[PDB]
Amino acid sequence: ASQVRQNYHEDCEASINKQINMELYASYVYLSMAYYFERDDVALPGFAKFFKESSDEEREHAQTFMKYQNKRGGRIVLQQIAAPSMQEWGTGLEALQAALDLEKQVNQSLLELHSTASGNNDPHLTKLLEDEYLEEQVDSIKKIGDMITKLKRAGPHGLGEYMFDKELN
Amino acid sequence: ASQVRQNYHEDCEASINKQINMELYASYVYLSMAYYFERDDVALPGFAKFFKESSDEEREHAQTFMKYQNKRGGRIVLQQIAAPSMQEWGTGLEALQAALDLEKQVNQSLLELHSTASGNNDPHLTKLLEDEYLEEQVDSIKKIGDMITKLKRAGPHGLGEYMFDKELN
Amino acid sequence: ASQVRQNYHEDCEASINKQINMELYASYVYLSMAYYFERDDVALPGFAKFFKESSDEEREHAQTFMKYQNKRGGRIVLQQIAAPSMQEWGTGLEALQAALDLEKQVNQSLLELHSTASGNNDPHLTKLLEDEYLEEQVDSIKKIGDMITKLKRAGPHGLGEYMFDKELN
Amino acid sequence: ASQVRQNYHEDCEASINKQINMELYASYVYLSMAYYFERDDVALPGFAKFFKESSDEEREHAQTFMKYQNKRGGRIVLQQIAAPSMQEWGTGLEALQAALDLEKQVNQSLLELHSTASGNNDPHLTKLLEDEYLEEQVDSIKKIGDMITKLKRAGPHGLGEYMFDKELN
Amino acid sequence: ASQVRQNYHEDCEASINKQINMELYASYVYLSMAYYFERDDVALPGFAKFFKESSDEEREHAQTFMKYQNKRGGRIVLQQIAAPSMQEWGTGLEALQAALDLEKQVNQSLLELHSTASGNNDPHLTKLLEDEYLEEQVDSIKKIGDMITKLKRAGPHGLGEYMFDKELN
Amino acid sequence: ASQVRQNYHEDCEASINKQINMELYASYVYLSMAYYFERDDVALPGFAKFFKESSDEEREHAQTFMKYQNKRGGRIVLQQIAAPSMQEWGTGLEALQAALDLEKQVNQSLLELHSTASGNNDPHLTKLLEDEYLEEQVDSIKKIGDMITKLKRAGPHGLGEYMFDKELN
Ligand SMILES: [Fe+3]
Ligand SMILES: [Fe+3]
Ligand SMILES: [Fe+3]
Ligand SMILES: [Fe+3]
Ligand SMILES: [Fe+3]
Ligand SMILES: [Fe+3]
Ligand code: NI
Ligand code: NI
Ligand code: NI
Ligand code: NI
Ligand code: NI
Ligand code: NI
Ligand code: NI
Ligand code: NI
Ligand code: NI
Ligand code: NI
Ligand code: NI
Ligand code: NI
């Protein structure tokens, strides 16, 4: 029996382990996009840098959940990380739309995890989710929505995509 | 046809893609070990920090290969990342032995990739492998060998493991 | 008999002298392009500056080979430098494509020289070629490939060429 | 018709193009001398450095004429650069005498170009020639004359050549 | 069985041990020359300092091989160090010629060791030899060749030897 | 006849030459011990560093005697340096005991040389020996005696040897 565990439901512990995998998956997707935009035949360095930083953030989200698991006396169980769904991501706009949709799926999963935590009356976990995850997700979704509108205004192809990429760099 | 590709054999391009997966796998293994050592019932912070840094290094190795692929005009193909073989890694010594064995497998794979590059007379790739990979691997293997000898001298269990962990921290 | 000469094959010495001429030729080509882009009826200062720096680099490559020749106890034999193939280089894009093709020819010549050095078991020369020439050539080819993709995105004519030129300046 | 061209005679434009080739030729001669003096069996580092700097100056003279051509709305036409007349330049004194004679030929060519510019009543070109070329040539000829006298006093062979070379370094 | 040893052939391990002895031998030779030039009846302090530094370098070369042996999991076996072939080294020129010949023998031995490493497909050892030994040897041989030419110009006896010695100091 | 030689007996000159060899021998022994402790299966970095510094000191002792020989107008005669008696030195304690015994043999040899110098009424040599050698030897013997007592208290094996090694580092 873990000496620190208190008011930590096994359903919460399992859902966190599933969420760690999702965060690692998203890290991997953004890493693929990052290097997709450094191909000699794409050469969008601003987009590359945006997705590299996003990739790093997602791995930090995974690590914060892993640390959270250990703090509550849960046990981390790591699974395989699926390959990204694409190898090639299209235009800058198509990648930002893909990222918008991923960020929303992650948000949905975090809200499901918040409801699991509430149903088990775990206010420490609901607080973690509100302060460190749900707020970041909403800011990110808004940021990516702004970027999509801006790229569609400026481009979304050709000189406009070239200009927008520099504001990202 | 990629505009930059010159003297880059498809066998070299495939072996690099396989090596990227191996590096990502090793990153994942060390990440698991890192958080294993932050469990309340393990609490070896020096070991945790050693494996966190190792995890980061392996992801950098993967990224350098991805960048290398793009520089030569190859195309990155990402696959799934297997789960680490264990969820729990035992003693500090058992983890260092596991890491020693992983580092040697990676070294073997890099030497196989060097032989593929030589057989296809690609001196740019053999040089990359010698300067950025094979040297690091030998230094790492020696470093981990030293650590194992030192932990077996000091411990490898109890107060000795507690003392050795602080030299890692 | 040169007092320093050791394990230096005359075929290697001749191929270096031919490579010095090629490097000087490329310097001259880029010098022509540089001043082509300072014509009152072209006025692409970013392109001018890119080709001026390229011209300087190529003369440095020639000088490093000349110094290398003297270090091994070979003897420098200088030939005439052909006129550039054009007097006028067209658009920024046409010049970058010409430079991409030149850089690849030079790369091919360096790889031939590496094979001559290997066949004569001269590891000092293969090392020179790998560290100081072949790596630079691959980075340059990738850089120019990126620039071409970027100019085709932004332009390649008109306002896009005007914008791209400023990122070069 | 070039939008900037005013009072610029085609004979002046052709003579400038011929003068650019001469300057590039002299650069090449001094570059050969420079590396001749870094041979293991010559080892006169002061002379090497003097001729390297001279080589650089001549390429700057060529570039100033190229820029001048573009400013007046002439068009640069580049020809082949002949090989230096020697591969080996003898003693330090023999090289300085060769350089003295080259500098005087260049001076003669510049004075011919000044007379062409005067005959066509181009005071902008006569001014360029007087301020940026003819003065430099006279100072250079005097400097090289001084050096020859000094080397003949000190040496011109043996310990004297060894001492003089250090005042050049 | 050494825990770190991987792809390290016993022939390579033996040749390294022989090379350590050669490096220590050369250190000893240069140490003898160094103090030979501090004799009251020789008093060439620049030569003394050159050979003292050379002596130190050779001991560093030996130490780098010893460290290399341990890194690969080989075992250092030290033998006796022969006495220098002379007790008295003659003129500064005779010592520089002796050093030139020693440096070339060492270079030959290193090239033999490179061929042993290649024949056993050890790219880590070939890389060590190319980056840390063969390049240094070629620069040293060229440097000593330059010095010999310079001393023969200035002297090689009497006032010229006295002047050259100060450029060494 | 050496112009500086005064009151310098040939027996003193020979004994100094023998003492130079002994000092070089001890340097070599400590160099072997130093790298013995950097083996992957020993990994006692504090001991390595202690013996590396000791090795350096002994070579300085040899050099001070060589310089002394030249100052008095004696002539340095260098002999072969025997291989160290072992290739492997055992435990840290066994090496410190070996070093204690070597330091005492050297001390005995220096005292014999002091008696030779006194018997020949050479107060300059007795002074050298007292100020620069005999005092250092006594401090070293005391230091090594202290270390042995301390290692036997702390260890001399296992965690104690691991702790003591850090006070050496
Ligand atoms: Fe996330
Ligand atoms: Fe790795
Ligand atoms: Fe080049
Ligand atoms: Fe000029
Ligand atoms: Fe050496
Ligand atoms: Fe001593
Ligand atoms: Ni973000
Ligand atoms: Ni599409
Ligand atoms: Ni590491
Ligand atoms: Ni177990
Ligand atoms: Ni470049
Ligand atoms: Ni055209
Ligand atoms: Ni000048
Ligand atoms: Ni002549
Ligand atoms: Ni040296
Ligand atoms: Ni002689
Ligand atoms: Ni000491
Ligand atoms: Ni024993």
Tell me the DSSP string of F22-83.
Answer: HHHHHHHHHHHHHHHTTSTTT--HHHHHHHHHHHHHHHHHHHHHHHHHHHHT-------BPP
Q: Which residues of chain F make contact with B142, given a CB cutoff of 8 A? A: 40
Distance CA B84, CA B55 (A): 12
> In the complex, which subunits touch A with 3 or more CB pairs below 8 angstroms?
B, C
Which residue, among E56, E53, E61, has the nearest Cα to E21 in the 3D structure? E61
CB-CB neighbors (< 8 A) of C150 in chain A: 43, 162
From CA C4, how far away is CA E104, in angstroms rounded? 8
Distance (Å) from the alpha carbon of B149 to chain F's nearest alpha carbon: 6
- Tell me which chain F residue has its CA closest to the CA of residue B160: F159
CA distance B98 to B144: 10
Q: What does the DSSP 8-state code read for residue B130?
A: I
Comparing CA positions, the residue from A132, A154, A11, A123 lying closest to residue A67 is A132
Size of interface D-E (CB pairs under 8 A): 32
Nearest to E116 by CA among E132, E103, E101, E128: E128
| Residue of chain C with shortest Cα separation from A156 | C153
Resolution in A: 2.4
The residue whose two tokens read 């030419």 is E149
Residues in a beta bridge with F81: E81
User: How far, in Å, CA of C55 to CA of C23, rounded?
Assistant: 9
Do F54 and F99 form a contact (C-beta atoms < 8 A)?
A: yes
Report the DSSP beta bridge partners of residue D81. Answer: C81
Rounded distance between C-alpha atoms, residue E137 and residue E146, angstroms? 14
Is the Cβ–Cβ distance between F53 and F18 less than 8 Å? no
Question: What one-character DSSP code corresponds to residue B155?
Answer: -
Residues C133-151, buried b or exposed e (16+ Cβ, 10 A)? bbbebbebbbbbbbbbbbb
Residue C123: is the preceding peptide bond cis (ω within 30°)?
no
Q: How far apart are CA D160 and CA E160, in angstroms?
A: 10
Could you tell me if C138 lies within 8 Å of chain D, comparing CB atoms?
no
Query: Does A137 carry a binding-site annotation?
Result: yes
> Dmax of chain F from CA atoms?
62
The DSSP bridge partners found for residue C81 are D81
CB-CB under 8 Å, E145 with C123: no
D156 cis-preceded (ω within 30 degrees of 0):
yes
- Are the CB atoms for F96 and F144 separated by under 8 Å? yes
- Structural contact between residues B55 and B24, judged by C-beta atoms closer than 8 angstroms: no
Instruction: Compare all CA atoms of chain C with the CA of E106 and give the residue at the minimum distance.
Output: C6
Query: Residue A60: which residues within 8 A CB-CB, separation 6 or more?
Result: none
Chain E residues closer than 8 Å to D162 by CB = 150, 153-154, 160, 163-164
DSSP for residue F84: P
- The dihedral over CA atoms of D102, D105, D111, D112, expressed in degrees to the nearest 10, equals -140
The answer to whether residues F76 and E35 touch, using CB atoms and an 8 Å cutoff, is yes
Q: Which amino acid is at F135?
A: E
Who contacts D106 (Cβ-Cβ below 8 Å, separation ≥6)? D22, D23, D26, D137
- How much helix, strand and coil, in percent to the nearest 5, is found in chain F? 75, 0, 25
SS (H, E, C) chain D: CCCCCCCCCHHHHHHHHHHHHHHHHHHHHHHHHHHHCCCCCCCCHHHHHHHHHHHHHHHHHHHHHHHHHHHHCCCCCCCCECCCCCCCCCCHHHHHHHHHHHHHHHHHHHHHHHHHHHHCCCHHHHHHHHHHHHHHHHHHHHHHHHHHHHHHHHCCCCHHHHHHHHHHC
User: Looking at the partner chain, which of E3, E121, E124 has a beta carbon nearest the beta carbon of B138?
Assistant: E124
Question: How far, in Å, from the CA of F57 to the mean position of ligand 6?
Answer: 7
Contact call for residues B72 and C138 (beta carbons, < 8 A): yes
Computed over its alpha carbons, how large is the radius of gyration of chain C? 18
**Using a CB-CB distance cutoff of 8 angstroms, which residues of chain B are in contact with residue F43?**
145-147, 149-150, 153
Compute the distance between CA of residue D89 and CA of residue D32 in angstroms, rounded to an integer: 9
Question: Are C40 and D70 contacting, i.e. CB atoms less than 8 angstroms apart?
Answer: yes
Residues pairing with E81 in the sheet: F81
* Chain F hits for E75, Cβ within 8 Å: 39, 87
Task: At A7, give phi and psi (nearest 5°).
Answer: 60, 35
Cα–Cα distance for residue pair E26/E84, rounded to 1 Å: 8
Residues 145-164, chain B, touching F (beta carbon < 8 A):
145-147, 149-150, 153-155, 159-160, 163-164
- Write the CB contacts of A40 (distance below 8 Å, at least 6 apart in sequence): B2, B3, B4, B70, B73, C142, C145, C146, C149
Q: Which residue of C has its CA nearest to B120?
A: C115
How many Å lie between the alpha carbon of F101 and the closest alpha carbon of chain B?
26
Is residue C137 part of an annotated ligand binding site?
yes
Cβ–Cβ under 8 Å, residues D105 and D43: no
Give the 3-state secondary structure of residue F90. Answer: coil
CA–CA dist D23, E159 (Å, integer): 42
Nearest chain C Cα to D66, which residue?
C35
SS (H, E, C) chain A: CCCCCCCCCHHHHHHHHHHHHHHHHHHHHHHHHHHHCCCCCCCCHHHHHHHHHHHHHHHHHHHHHHHHHHHHCCCCCCCCECCCCCCCCCCHHHHHHHHHHHHHHHHHHHHHHHHHHHHCCCHHHHHHHHHHHHHHHHHHHHHHHHHHHHHHHHCCCCHHHHHHHHHHC
Instruction: Enumerate residues 6+ apart whose C-beta is below 8 A from A27.
Output: A55, A56, A58, A59, A62
Q: Where are the alpha helices (DSSP H) in B37-134?
A: 45-72, 92-119, 123-129
Determined by which method? X-ray
Cβ pair A146, A100 in contact under 8 A = no
- d(CA D59, CA D28) in angstroms, rounded, equals 9
CA-based Rg of chain B, rounded to a whole angstrom? 18
CA distances to C2, C10, C117, C124, C168 from C7, rounded to whole Å, are 12, 10, 11, 9, 44
SS3 E81: strand
Question: What is the distance between the terminal CA atoms of chain B, rounded to a whole angstrom?
Answer: 50
Instruction: Please answer whether residues C16 and C68 qualify as being in contact, where contact means their C-beta atoms are separated by less than 8 angstroms.
Output: yes
Chain C contacts of D38, Cβ < 8 Å? 67, 70
Task: Mark out the alpha helices in chain C (DSSP H runs).
Answer: 10-36, 45-72, 92-119, 123-129, 135-154, 159-168
C-alpha distances (whole Å) from C77 to each of C24, C36, D88, E137 are 13, 30, 9, 25
Residue tagged 């840098």 (tokens): A49
Shortest CB distance from A70 goes to which of B2, B40, B75? B40
Q: One-letter amino acid identity for F155?
A: G
* Known binding positions of B: 23, 57-58, 61, 103, 131, 136-137, 140
How is residue A125 written in tokens? Answer: 């976990």
Kindly give the distance from the C-alpha atom of residue C79 to the centroid of ligand 3, in angstroms, as a whole number: 17
Are E40 and F3 within 8 A, CB to CB?
yes
End-to-end CA distance of chain C, in Å? 50
Minimal C-alpha gap between E167 and chain D (Å)? 10
Nearest-angstrom CA–CA distance, B157 and A27: 37
C27 with C62: CB under 8 angstroms?
yes
C36 lies within 8 A of chain D by CB: yes
- For residue E141, the ligand closest to its alpha carbon is 15
Measured between alpha carbons, how far is E69 from E17 in angstroms, rounded to an integer? 8
Ligand with the closest atom to the CA of F93? 18
CB contact under 8 A, C134 and B123: yes
Q: Which CATH class is domain F10-168?
A: mainly alpha
Say how many residues make up chain E.
169
Cα(F131)–Cα(F126) distance, integer angstroms: 9
Per domain, the residue ranges of chain D are 10-168
- Alpha carbon of A47: minimum distance to chain C alpha carbons (Å): 13
With a CB cutoff of 8 Å and minimum separation 6, the contacts of A124 are A7, A72
Scanning every residue of chain B, which has its alpha carbon at the shortest distance from the alpha carbon of E2? B145
**How far is it, in rounded angstroms, from Cα D79 to Cα D102?**
19
Residue A131 is assigned to a ligand binding site: yes
Neighbours of C160 (CB within 10 A): 20
Chain E touched by C3 (CB under 8 Å): yes
The alpha carbon of residue C82 and the mean position of all alpha carbons in its chain are separated, in whole angstroms, by 15
The CA B55 to ligand 9 mean position distance, Å, reads: 8
E40 at interface of F, judged by CB pairs closer than 8 A: yes
DSSP E75: -
Q: What is the DSSP letter of F8?
A: -
- Count how many residues are written for chain B: 169
Cβ neighbourhood burial of D34 (10 Å; 0-12, 13-18, 19+): buried
Which chain E residues touch D43 with a CB distance below 8 Å?
145-147, 149-150, 153
CA nearest A116: which of A134, A129, A102?
Answer: A129
φ, ψ dihedrals at A70, nearest 5°? -65, -35
